[PDB]
């Protein structure tokens, strides 16, 4: 186990892009790889620790593969919702992503409103995350905060979800 | 199409300098390469994402090519005048350039006053944007701001342009 | 002598992890390597300067070896305690670690209470260093300060131990 | 000429360390190399622009050669004092050096008080400038400012030397 997740993380980015472009295009390999990450104790938090430390373009290429293959995004965020603490590990890496990555994540959700709402329901069903999530937004810089407001109200129903919390 | 721009972006910097140098040394290749970026849906925002995430020295070498080869700078900021989200996307990635890169970009424009004024007109001829440009001065470190001030005061005309708004 | 520590620092990170994964799995090599670093004049400062500048995953992985091999963690902070000024250089690089590394370091100590208290003793034992540790903990992002309190409060004894100082 | 400084800057760090460890051990090569940088129009500001963007350990290893070969440090701060902008191109990169590098630079001068005095006089002999040095130390982290004050207290003569301006 452990040597695989470091071997992956220390490949050159082109090989990691190729590895993920194989994996999340084949549901039969995706499903069982996330079984491997939960069969070894805590190993899903070692895969996510390695993930958030990647070159930021590989992180956006990964979220671009999931959001555009949404038959696997709802399942992926079911693993991190079922496993306690992993949702808090997500947000406390999301706050630290270099801001182009936060912008591309935000675009990818507001441009696919089903996958925004489904993600936003998991922040209720993993308990107590919303006060931290509101604080993440509140600690962003004034440029990103202004731009996210101007971007979000391109769909005022998602503005209402953001007001409902 | 898109995998070419990833392949390009993941090359070692010397290959990208060599590619961008051979590209903009040939106006007949420059024009059509941007037609390829503009005809594929949305793809120019994916090339520009890959640009702002480059090694900082390749970003200055690229601007150092255009401004000192300016018969292609006049065309380049025409493409970003055409596409209404792209000028917003430029400034809100400019603010996230390294302070040494912002300093060198400002030197590069103020030392070529025609190409300063042309860029400054595009901020008015594109919708909105100009209040982002002002705040993206005002949000910088006090040392950077004093330096960029003591730089621009060399030209009372370019001082008049920035102070007219 | 000095060339070994630069050659090591400039190897690709997999070779460094291989080198450390051998070294602190062999106590007969561990004690010899650190004796060479204490004996050559100032070389223990040059190994630690090269350590805090590493790729953040090699830094996490190194602490992940020591804390789980505590028969060597005991010795390691004995060497720094027997080299006055090194405990200053420790904290004054810890404050500059990437937040994901500080978070994992804290996690590794509170999940191994003996090795938290052992570390905490040397903050008294190196003359007056404790005040710099308290001050550094006050100088972190406000959501990370609350996250470290929420994490530490999982053990009320160690929660008491940081409050009784 | 100009392409040499990019070919150099894009070599792997071991080659740059080798190239510099050859150069500032041979005064006959050192004076010639900087004469080329002085003669080609603006090229010394292109070398310094490439220098301050280096991997931070190469920046320290370079100053660690000069200060310990001070018979070449005296000449080096003729060049950067003679071009009237170049001293500002030091300080407006020095404020942007990573904090561990600024600490190791400061330590390296405080351990050689005559080379500290030599550098400090060149700030006054280059036009104006000294108020930027006072501002730079006032803008560092509170931990760094406190630590540099306690580090400089190791030499009361240099405490007087920084107080007398």
Numbering used by the authors:
A (entry chain E): 333 to 497
B (entry chain G): 499 to 663
C (entry chain C): 167 to 331
D (entry chain A): 1 to 165
Reproduce passages from the article:
Here we describe a systematic approach to generating modular and rigid repeat protein oligomers with coincident C2 to C8 and superhelical symmetry axes that can be readily extended by repeat propagation. From these building blocks, we demonstrate that a wide range of unbounded fibres can be systematically designed by introducing hydrophilic surface patches that force staggering of the monomers; the geometry of such fibres can be precisely tuned by varying the number of repeat units in the monomer and the placement of the hydrophilic patches. All multiplexes follow the naming convention CsHRN_Rr where s is the cyclic symmetry, HR stands for helical repeat, R is the number of repeats in a single chain and N is an index to differentiate between multiplexes of the same symmetry.
We determined the high-resolution structures of five designs from C2 to C6 symmetry by X-ray crystallography, cryogenic electron microscopy (cryoEM) or both.
